[PDB]
């Protein structure tokens, strides 16, 4: 997963923080739901 | 890695409060491969992606 | 699930988005003011000083032409020509054939 | 007197130009204005930022050659708008230059600002 350290920290990113937010929900889904043995997430926060 | 301080690059470990705080060990699971990674290069042979 | 920070401490540094912007601000304007009091010390140099005594002062570039060539064959030097072929081979070949 | 002269050595001239006024806008514009030396006005600390100059200005010149300057002379109050917009002193132009060719000063002036004249014309002449 392509993550950002900065959540709408900087001016206007249209709805890029939002996206890059949203993909964390995976870190919890991973174990909530069923799809565990099908793929495991990595989620990169990508630096400057 | 110096006591008290996080490396520039690191890996993190969710605590059961639910933060994801720098984790020492994991971080330097990460960084020795990164080492080892510099000193052999890794294979990727059979990796489909 | 594994979660890696590759962000090289910018975590750390406080206010980011203002400080980032101070940064760009600082730079563009010590490019700005350093670019327009250049560009008039070099007006005020043509009036006191004279635009003729600064016009023999410019170089003149010269823009290239094309000169369309023919190509031939480059002939070495004999002593050159000799080391390529076997030294026997001189006057063995019927050059009419 | 009509004829031709040589007398340059006896030849001088003084000019009143006109006023140029001046809105410092920016923070390079107030820059621009500190990088030359005949700009030079009483407290430094003086905060230009979003005035408006003027700039009355008389230019004393010298002839030595046909048109080259001998010397030139160019001097004259700073002045800054108030709410008023009365105009008070804020400084001086005090430019100087022997052997020079075209007065500097008022050449910034004419194309950095805009030149006020006094006279303002009717819609149409109006005969008498």
Known sequence: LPMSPNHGTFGGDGMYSESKLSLETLFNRWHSESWANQLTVCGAIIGW | ?49 | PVMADLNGGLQFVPELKEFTAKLRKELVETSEVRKAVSIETALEHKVVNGNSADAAYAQVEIQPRANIQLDFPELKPYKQVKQIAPAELEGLLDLER | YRGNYTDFENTFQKTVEPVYQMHIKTSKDIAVLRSKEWFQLDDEDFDLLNKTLTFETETEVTFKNANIFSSVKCFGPIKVELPTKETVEIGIVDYEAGASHGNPVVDFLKRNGSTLEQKVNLENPIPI
Do not use: C, M
């Open chain 2, 1 to 49: 890695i110096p006591r008290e301080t996080i490396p520039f690059l690191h890996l993190r470990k969710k605590t059961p409060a639910g933060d994801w705080k720098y984790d020492r060990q994991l971080s330097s699971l990460f960084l020795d491969g990164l080492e080892k990674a510099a000193f052999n290069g890794v294979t990727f042979k059979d990796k489909y992606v």
